[PDB]
Design a protein around this ligand. Structure first.
Ligand code: SHN
Ligand code: NI
Ligand code: NI
Lengths: 119, 119
């Protein structure tokens, strides 16, 4: 009934998509959502609209899109809302819920500190 | 003796730099490092080389550079190591230690899950 779509930038290198994929795997491991899908903005497949369609086709009425990005930018404020047609398609009776990026979360400062220490 | 330099992409929007800055503030608040500096790759000041010089000028011999990026890409594997002259202005008796990005860390999946729930 609800689907989680993780959305990433995309890269010409593969690392970015690997990251999204490992992220999806890990949230799958927590058994919280019925459907869990990924989409990249540029370069790679699946694309965002592809992932959104794939989610609807599995019978989701409420689509939770999380931008896996540290900050807001043009990607998160123009391109992506556009691609989900929240600015400029999708069954009338389906709502896309566009969430917030990671931001300056305490857990990020934990992660950064670990990274400083080669841990 | 050791300095932490947080390094970010930069955007034409301000959000990115705000993020770096809030991150620096938070790690400053944890009193773990003598010196804590930020640099953006493009669009904004301070720049990476500026932040590195600012760190040396405060008497740091070991400079810990953490790329605040989710994944590896061109920025983290070419441009930044280049800018720190690790592949091709640094006193010979100073070492730059180039750390790892955030990656698919469990704490990120925690954060993502929170974001799905509008928390
Ligand atoms: C290689 C390249 C390929 C390409 O994307 O074209 C690339 C790659 C990546 N960017 C990433 C991150 C961001 N990129 C932006 C913004 C811009 N990045 C741009 C270009 C390029 N970015 C190409 C370099 C061409 C060159 O320098 O030679 C601009 C100029 C053009 C544009 O993107 O349209 C645009 C400036 C604003 C504008 O467009 O006006 C923002 C901020 C924002 O969005 O405002 C973030 C924050 C991300 C975050 O916060 O997480 C990540 C993952 C970052 C991560 O993992 O954290 C990758 C992956 C990788 O580097 O391989
Ligand atoms: Ni981009
Ligand atoms: Ni870039």
């Amino acid at each position: 009934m609800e689907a989680l779509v993780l959305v990433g930038h995309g890269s010409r290198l593969p690392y970015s998509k690997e990251l999204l994929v490992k992220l999806a795997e890990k949230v799958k491991e927590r058994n919280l959502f019925p459907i869990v899908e990924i989409g990249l903005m540029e370069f790679s497949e699946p694309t965002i609209p592809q992932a959104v369609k794939k989610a609807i086709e599995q019978g989701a009425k409420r689509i939770i899109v999380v931008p896996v990005f540290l900050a807001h930018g043009i990607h998160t404020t123009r391109d992506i809302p556009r691609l989900l047609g929240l600015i400029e398609e999708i069954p009338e009776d389906v709502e896309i819920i566009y969430r917030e990026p990671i931001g300056a979360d305490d857990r990020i400062v934990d992660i950064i500190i670990d990274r400083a220490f080669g841990r």
